[PDB]
Amino acid sequence: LLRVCLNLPYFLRYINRFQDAVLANSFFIMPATVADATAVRNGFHSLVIDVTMALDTLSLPVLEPLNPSRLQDVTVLSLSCLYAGVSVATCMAILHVGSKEDDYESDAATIVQKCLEIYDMIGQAISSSRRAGGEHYQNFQLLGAWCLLNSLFLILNLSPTALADKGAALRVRDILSRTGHQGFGVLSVILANHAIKLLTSLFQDLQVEALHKGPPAALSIMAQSTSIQRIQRLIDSVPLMNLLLTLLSTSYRKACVLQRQRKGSRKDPELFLGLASNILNFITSSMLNSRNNFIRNYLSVSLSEHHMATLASIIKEVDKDGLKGSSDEEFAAALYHFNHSLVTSDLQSPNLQNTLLQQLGVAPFSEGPWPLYIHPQSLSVLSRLLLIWQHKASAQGDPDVPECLKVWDRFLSTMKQNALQGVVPSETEDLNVEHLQMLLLIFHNFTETGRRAILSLFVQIIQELSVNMDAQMRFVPLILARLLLIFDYLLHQYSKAPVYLFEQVQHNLLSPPATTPLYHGFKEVEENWSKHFSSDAVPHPRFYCVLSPEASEDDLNRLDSVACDVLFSKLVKYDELYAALTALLA
C-alpha cells in the first residue's frame, strides 16, 4: 500500500518538487502564473481523488514497522501531500489577486484539509512509534514548519503586479533576495494555524533545553540536530519574526473587514482573530518570554520601527474599535499582553519604544497638544513605559526622567490652553481618570525639584487664567475644574503617594482590556449627571475624584505641611495666587 500511495499519479509531481525543495531549502511553487494556477485548478478533481485515496490508505493500519527505510518513505509521502496543499492554496491566492467555480474551491479546500491530515497522521504515527518516535518526530516537525512557513510567506508576497509581470517556480529565496500583502485567506489561515503549532513546539523544545546549549539543521528526519539548529534552520530559511507579524497584521485586518461587512471564503472575522491571537501568544511566550539568548538576540535584531508602527496601528485599531464583541476581547487582551511584554522586554530598543509612542500619538517629547483622553491600550502601554523608566532612574538614584517631566509640562500647557479657551471638551477630548491617576503616580516618583516645579507651574497657570475674569465668567470650566481637582489632590497628597493610587494604576492600566476602572467620584455631581444621562450604564467618568473619600478634616493642617512650605517659598507667590483663586469663583 505504501508503494501504491507513493506511486499515485498526481502525487509524484509534488513529491519530486518537494524533494528538490528540500535541497538548499529552495522552496518553490509552480502555479505562480494565473494561467498556471488555472491549470492546477483544472487538475484539482483527480488531485482530490488521489489525496483522499492516500489519506484512507494511511488511515487503515500501514507502515507498522516504522524502520528508517519506511519511516523515511512515509515522511516523504506526508510532506508531499503537505506541498500539494500549499501549492493549491498558492494557486487559489493567485486566482484571487487576478480577480464549477465553487466546485473547484471545494476541491481545493478538501485537498488542503486532507493533505494536512495525512501529515498529521504520519506525524502522530512517528511520534506514537517505538521505532523512531522522538528526534525523528522533531525533525518531521521542522520539515513541516519549514514547508508551511515558506508557503505562507510566498502566498503573502504574491502581488497582482508581480503576477502579471510573470504572465513558474515560486522561489521564496528570490522574493527575499529581491527584497498590499494580498492572497491571505481561509486556506492561508489554516496553514498559518498549523504552522504556528509546529513553531510553538520547536521553541518549547528550545526553552526546556539548557539556555544557548553550529549550522542550520538539515532537512532530514534521520538527521540528528539540536533544537536550536532546527529553529536556526527555520529562521535561515525564512524570517520567523517578519512572517509571524505579517500573518498577524493581515489576519487582524481581514477580521476587521469581515466585521465591517457584517455591520453593513469564510466571512467569520473570529477565524482570523483566532489566528492573530495565537500569533501574539506564540511570540510573547515562545519568544518574548524565552530566556534563550539566541532567541532574544534574534528578536531584538528582527525588531524594526516598521514592526512598532504596525503594532501601534493594531493597538489603536483595537482601542478605537468601540466593539468588545467576544473573540475581539480575547485578541484585545492578547494585544495588550504583547504590548506590555514589548515595553518590559529589553528587546524593544528605546528608539523602538519612542517610535511606538509617537505612532500611538502619546510621544512624551512630541509637540502640539497633549492627548487629554488616551485610548485603553495606548494609555496602559504609555504608563508602563514611563513607570519602568522612572524605576530605572530610582533604582540607580538617577535624576527625574525628562520624558515624564516633559509629559507633565506639555499636559499642563494643554490644560491651560483649554481653560484659557474655556471650551467644554467631548468624552474623547476629555482627560481620562486612569490617565490622571498615572500622571499623579509619575509626579510622586519625581524628586523635590520636579514636584516643586510642577506645583509652581500650576500656581502660575491658575494666576494667568484669572487674568481675564470676563472670559472665565462666560467659559465652561470643565477643564479648569479638572485643573483645580488636580491641584487639590496635590495639596492632600504631595509629599507621599497613596496606596489606593498604586492599586488604581495596577488595576486599571496594569491590566488587559474588573472592566470598570478603579477611582472615586463626586457623589452629588454624579447624582445630577444621572438626573440627565444615559440609563444603561455610565460609559465614561466625566465627573470623578482622586483625593479619595478622605475622612472629613478641618482646614487645620488639611494642606500638606511640605505643600504649605512650598506655597510660601519664593517660587510660589501664594498671597497673589490666593487672590486669583478668590476671583476664580466667578
Partner: protein, 186 residues
C-alpha cells in the same frame, strides 16, 4: 519585627491561613531572602522552620490568592524553593528539616497541595518557638511590591473553577522557578 511574622504563622496555625495576613508573609520572605540564603548556623533552625511553615501555608491557600497578590506569592515561592534546593544539594547538620521533608516541600510548592503532616507541622512550630533568631513602613512595602509588579509582568499564556485555574497558574509559576534553578538537575 521577626515576632509579627510568626503571628500569621501561629494565628493561621490555629484555624487555617488568613488570606489577609498572607500579603504580609510574602513580603517578609522576599525581604529576608538574602538572609535565609547566607545565614549563620546559630539561627539555622529558626530559618529552616520559617521556610517550611511558609511553604506549607502558601500551598494551603494556593487555590485562593488575590489575582493581584498572586505575583508576589510566586516571588516568595521562588525564594522558598531556592532555600529548599540549596539545602537538598548541601545537607546541613544544623538544618532542622529532613531531606525527605524538604523534597516534599518542593513537591508541594510545585504541585496541587502540601503534604507535611500536622505532627511534623507542630514539630516545626516548636523548632520556631525556639526564637533562636539573629504605617510608613507598610506604605514603603506597598511601593516596593508596586515596582515588583511593574517588572514582574504576568504573561499568563495558557469562581470555584477560576480558583482552581489560579491554583494551576501558581503551580506552573513554581515549576518554572524550580526549573529556573535547574533544580531538576540538582
Amino acid at each position: 519585627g521577626w515576632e509579627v511574622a510568626v503571628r500569621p504563622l501561629l494565628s493561621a496555625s490555629y484555624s487555617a491561613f488568613e488570606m489577609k495576613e498572607l500579603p504580609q508573609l510574602v513580603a517578609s520572605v522576599i525581604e529576608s531572602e538574602s538572609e535565609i540564603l547566607h545565614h549563620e548556623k546559630q539561627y539555622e533552625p529558626f530559618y529552616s522552620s520559617f521556610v517550611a511553615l511558609s511553604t506549607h501555608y502558601i500551598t494551603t491557600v494556593c487555590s485562593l490568592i488575590p489575582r493581584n497578590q498572586l505575583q508576589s506569592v510566586a516571588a516568595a515561592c521562588k525564594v522558598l524553593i531556592e532555600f529548599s534546593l540549596l539545602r537538598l544539594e548541601n545537607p546541613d547538620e544544623a538544618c532542622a528539616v529532613s531531606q525527605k521533608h524538604l523534597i516534599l516541600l518542593i513537591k508541594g510548592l510545585c504541585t496541587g497541595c502540601s503534604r507535611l503532616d500536622r505532627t511534623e507541622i507542630i514539630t516545626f512550630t516548636a523548632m520556631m518557638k525556639s526564637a533562636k533568631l539573629p504605617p510608613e513602613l507598610r506604605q514603603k512595602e506597598v511601593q516596593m511590591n508596586f515596582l515588583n509588579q511593574l517588572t514582574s509582568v504576568f504573561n499568563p499564556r495558557t469562581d470555584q473553577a477560576s480558583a482552581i485555574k489560579t491554583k494551576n497558574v501558581f503551580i506552573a509559576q513554581n515549576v518554572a522557578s524550580l526549573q529556573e534553578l535547574g533544580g531538576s538537575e540538582k
